[PDB]
Paper text:
The cyclic oligonucleotide-based antiphage signalling system (CBASS) and the pyrimidine cyclase system for antiphage resistance (Pycsar) are antiphage defence systems in diverse bacteria that use cyclic nucleotide signals to induce cell death and prevent viral propagation. Here we show that phages encode anti-CBASS (Acb) and anti-Pycsar (Apyc) proteins that counteract defence by specifically degrading cyclic nucleotide signals that activate host immunity. Using a biochemical screen of 57 phages in Escherichia coli and Bacillus subtilis, we discover Acb1 from phage T4 and Apyc1 from phage SBSphiJ as founding members of distinct families of immune evasion proteins. We confirmed the critical role for Apyc1 metal-coordinating residues and identified E74 and Y112 from the opposing protomer as further catalytic residues required for cCMP hydrolysis and release of the reaction product 5′-CMP. Together, these findings demonstrate that Acb1 and Apyc1 constitute separate families of immune evasion proteins and explain the distinct reaction mechanisms that degrade CBASS or Pycsar cyclic nucleotide signals.
We next determined crystal structures of Acb1 to define the mechanism of anti-CBASS evasion. Structures of Acb1 from the Erwinia phage FBB1 in the apo state (1.1 Å) and in complex with 3′3′-cGAMP (1.2 Å) reveal that Acb1 adopts a compact 2H phosphoesterase fold with six central β-strands that form a U-shaped ligand-binding pocket. On substrate recognition, the flexible carboxy-terminal residues 145–152 form an ordered lid that closes over the top of the captured 3′3′-cGAMP ligand. Recombinant T4 Acb1 rapidly degrades the CBASS signals 3′3′-cGAMP, cUA and cAAA, but does not cleave cGG, demonstrating that Acb1 is responsible for the broad cyclic nucleotide hydrolysis activity observed in T4-infected cell lysate. The broad specificity of Acb1 allows evasion of diverse CBASS operons with a single gene, and the ability of Acb1 to cleave cyclic trinucleotide species suggests that this enzyme may also enable evasion of type III CRISPR systems that use cAAA signals.
Numbering used by the authors: 1 to 137
């Protein structure tokens, strides 16, 4: 099948992301166990080696709406992360594909904000706990 890789976060990072969701009163918030950042979304599978260790990968981000393929207005925290961009480029160097114009690392915070709008720039220590790799439907 395809390949999906994402990063999961430390307990302190998850606490900060849930605080952001609660403080903004977001509808349809992503559950704590589901918070993540996609690295690889490839229709082809390659032997990507998940990372080992834990460390900070971003210290800030900006809110943006990323429409989903079903037409939902999802709200995300968009980051500039040398680490995540380098891991995406590692997957590409191994042969993975990414059928979108650009890779823009982000953490989805709400699945669907309806007609609402949200704007902001946030300081959040984003600490990688682990990466996971799995088959993509």
């Amino acid at each position: 099948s395809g390949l999906y890789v994402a990063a999961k976060f430390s307990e302190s990072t998850l606490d900060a992301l849930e605080e952001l969701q609660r403080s903004l009163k977001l509808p349809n918030p992503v559950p704590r166990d589901k918070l993540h950042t996609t690295i690889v979304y490839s229709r082809v599978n390659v032997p990507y080696k998940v990372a080992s260790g834990s460390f900070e990968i971003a210290d800030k981000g900006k809110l943006t709406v990323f429409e989903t393929q079903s037409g939902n207005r999802a709200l995300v925290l968009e980051m500039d992360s040398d680490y995540l961009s380098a891991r995406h480029s590692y997957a590409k160097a191994l042969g993975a594909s990414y059928d979108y114009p650009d890779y823009r690392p982000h953490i989805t915070l709400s699945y669907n904000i309806g007609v609402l709008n949200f704007s902001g720039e946030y300081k959040v220590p984003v600490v990688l706990d682990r990466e996971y790799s799995e088959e993509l439907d």
